[PDB]
Symmetry: D2
């Protein structure tokens, strides 16, 4: 009996995880939000899958769904997941990402599933924020730098407390940045791949970014959802960093993306006056706008996933260069078939 409940099934990770579990013959249940528009674009090709209307702020819907489904595995991926937006939506973010995690854990307990459920929490490298060690591993102290980070920190610790207090098999995947062709359009990697694709097709000339010097450890969502499953296959409930260990700047992401459409970016100017110019044509394609900066930036992330390599035998398959290629190529195809986004 293999029955998964995925919160956040409509998101990037949820959509890949649903595919991965379906291929293994799981019965997959997802919680979807009511919307005035179509909102199941990433999973519509899959309808073994059942969707249920719910929200992580509605305690009764969560108990009803868990009590009806009686899952063997719960993946809490549901969240207001955007860091910049969390500064203007601090309270909603706290209620969904922090308190919502508690609601789900409490529903497990309320439904008498404390000894049968395995629970995965979507923890995050944003917890390290202003990094206290380089690289960051499971024992690096946390230092959040946004309302999102603070809410995720609550979630991390309440999960730990349920494991310790009630012997719930509950784990924190401390996943570093992961991307894909299904990545939200207002995250930096997809913003770049979409804009580069549009420039290639003559639908756009120039776009603006924020902090070009931010550095990230970027992997592929499809690899990372497998690690989530492996953490629940472990005999003991343990927390794990999942990451590539390799660091690149936003600037490098831009450079590599443009090279895939035959353009070499050369930078000129500094800070908010910095521009990225195509060497071959002389045309400006990238500018900087201060409005995209965060009040408290996370400058640098680099994960050490030695523990996961040893215990889970997990290794990332997609490296940064192939990630950039796949994203630009996919968005060229997407924008060619349909110029409207």
């Amino acid at each position: 009996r293999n029955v998964a409940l995925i919160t956040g099934i409509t998101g990037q990770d949820g959509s890949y995880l649903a595919e991965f579990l379906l291929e293994k013959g799981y019965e997959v249940h997802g919680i979807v939000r009511r919307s005035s528009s179509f909102n199941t674009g990433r999973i519509e090709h899959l309808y073994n899958m059942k969707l249920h209307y719910g929200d992580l702020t509605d305690s009764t819907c969560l108990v009803k769904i868990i009590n009806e489904v009686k899952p063997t595995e719960i993946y809490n991926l549901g969240a207001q997941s955007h860091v910049k937006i969390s500064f203007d939506l601090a309270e909603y973010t706290a209620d969904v990402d922090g308190v919502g995690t508690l609601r789900l854990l409490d529903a497990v307990k309320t439904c008498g599933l404390i000894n049968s459920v395995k629970f995965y929490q979507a923890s995050t490298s944003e917890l390290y924020g202003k990094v206290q060690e380089i690289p960051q591993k499971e024992t690096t102290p946390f230092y959040p730098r946004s309302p999102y980070g603070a809410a995720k920190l609550y979630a991390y610790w309440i999960v730990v407390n349920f494991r310790e207090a009630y012997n719930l098999f509950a784990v924190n995947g401390i996943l570093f940045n992961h991307e894909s062709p299904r990545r939200g359009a207002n995250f930096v990697t997809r913003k770049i791949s979409r804009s580069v694709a549009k420039i290639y097709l003559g639908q756009l000339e120039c776009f603006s970014l924020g902090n070009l010097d931010a550095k990230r450890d970027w992997g592929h969502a499809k690899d990372y959802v497998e690690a989530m499953w492996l953490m629940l296959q472990n005999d003991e409930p343990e927390d794990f960093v999942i990451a590539t260990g390799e660091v690149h700047s936003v600037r490098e992401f831009v450079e590599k993306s443009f090279l895939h459409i035959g353009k070499t970016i050369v930078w000129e100017g500094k800070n908010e006056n910095e521009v990225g110019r195509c060497k071959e044509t002389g045309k400006v394609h990238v500018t900087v706008d201060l409005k995209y900066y965060r009040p408290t930036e996370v400058d640098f992330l680099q994960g050490d996933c030695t523990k996961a390599k040893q215990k889970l035998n997990w290794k990332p398959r997609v490296a940064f260069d192939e990630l950039v290629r796949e994203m630009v190529h996919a968005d060229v195809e997407l924008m060619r078939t349909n110029p409207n986004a």
Copy 2:
């Protein structure tokens, strides 16, 4: 001089039409949009005078920030979990958004010192009449809600009344009866029918299932009804108004008329959950009934009397039921032809 609107629910059916209507009048239009993991501004993307702000009706702080920054002259609270069937499984969220959310917005107006400068429109509803206590229903008909949606909207109606009476806020309840359009949510009955009929016409679908075929509704066009919202805020006195067509049709009639527009005459056979709708010309079944689409407490009949609005606002509906059905089926044929996955 200064005409600045704040629309909650700007991404929805009504919000998108209201935004166009106000922009045409030279308003500066602000909208509150929810964060989503997917694109969610499809009904208003052609418009970007318009500024969008991330917010949620359950986050009191975001609402005060936005109202304090924008300082609107007009607020239209259209934001809601608006689906009645879904409200039975999302009762608490529905209460928090549709009921308490209305209070949050009113309180933000007061907190920001705008009680004497803002005109506030609340999206009230014929669902308030529920198990109807008079036929037709007018402003003085007693309410009798029949869902967690209806109950939440009733709270909202009364808290609006209380702000008007307590603090002299110009605040009004539009008691709007069902209104539809080509932008209507796909899981409301009218659009579900028009989309499914369009798909059948184009060979993309053979058959679809519905719930209670005997429900009766007063159906108008969203584009006409957003004008009434604006007129209620142009009034010298803050008054509540029923807005409706006065004409009643069944779900069954909506199905029949929709199919006639693609050259098919539906004839029904069987009863209750075994009832089917068959094309007379071909003998093929196109409509079945499934109990899962029924509501635990149905609203059987609505018919609005908008005499007060006719007299005071000079508002009259322009689109009648038959033209509404035609426009919806025709628009969804065009939509599904251009894109079979829409």
Copy 3:
């Protein structure tokens, strides 16, 4: 098997209801709020009674408690019950009095008790607000005049919807004002009885009130909790007005209270300048202060409880004059024994 769960057990009504049910051999459970101070003064003499920490805004505690207790009868008396305070606490009042009622109902459903629980909702004459009929009965249209009234109206209707949708035996007691020596100190009747008692004992000289012309139908809480029980003994779940049918002003309450300590109040002046003077001494004991007025006053309430008389055989035992006497007498004793009481 007779097992009651009372929300609001620490309040006026809860304390009387708990005694009444205990006398009948019920197992009585109460939900009590955590407080930094002692808060069980009305029920401490009773500890068949079990208390549970909870709150009507905490969905998980309610499911846990209902699932553990498995009550046959639930009395939802828990509320922010003060009308004037509801104007400054509008949202909290909505969450507790409105949404809290839904949470309790949904917990009944979630726990599989929809066909075994009988549910009493504490509805109220405040629903009639700006009265549309005189007297008011079950069929009088509602017209709330406060955030409290609006929240209670939501609660009334969501109860009706659970009864109609799921065949829950759920009822609205539409109780008119009821008082006692245990009445909250900042309601008008108890404010008067305490202040009059203090004046009698030389602990106070004068106090201020708001609208002296408000008129109310006043009964005794001890009689009214019996009606709540009777409504759950009914074969069919029906809503009932409970009231005396007799109307008196705040001014009369003041006059009658002072007569019990040997003072005849004579009024002079109008509106906010009106004062109440003891005829025997010439001393001013009552003034008016605009801060005690409500933005939207409820001027007049008078209940017609014909339906309850016919179907429940309920009749009020304590009339207004005895209510005034009991309250002043009790507060004299209270303030004599303890001047800080």
Copy 4:
């Protein structure tokens, strides 16, 4: 212009802080919860003080109050502060102690007071939970062990984020256990002092406790509220541990408390069968009950307040033995004057 807003003014700390600030000529505002009973016992002797109805779960009331008062200093002491109760009230505790802190900070920002307010957060030694260093100081990593601890951790970090993001003068006082004659009756120290006082006066024979071997660093609330004020007088917004550095067991608190009424406790038995007998009379006065244990106990706390000593010149005046004496003596007087106190 010195205007303080105290959330939690009715609690232990709030009541001492209010006195301390009033003595300095502050205008003091407090947020008080609506209650069905009298709940201002600790501050009634003070009414320069203005009280406002509010709740930390009602965002609108908090903005209204802050906008009206325009405080120069805010002390966020309001909380569901009981650790054992937090396990059954996990969600409410998260909403009040965690999200409530954010609501207050956001109201400061919304009201345009980011550059004029100094904000004190009531952080706590419970953040150290399963202690990662002994003694614990500002740089010891946190490890919460309850829903209370997890909620307070959110609050700690969201305060840090407002300081770093918007240059708000905002500080975390990391206060270790502090007690007084006004301590809540269900905390262990006051439970002991009240029960011992009752035994001395013949109002009780025996009481039950939980984990007798837990160890704590106990100081006096009156000393600790002064540190809160000093942290806001600092030129730079800094976080500080406040503690005695001296550790004692619950068992020692029992022994020392009984000594003060002329009784020597001698223990017999183990675990939940352990009892405490008066050596002089042979009578049993203490038993153990498993229901008082916590699912995830905090076994040991010991604070290092070196930083506060150096920068604030703060030193605790009351040591453990005098604290025990003051509490037992005060509760003897209290229970003698009023057996129901």
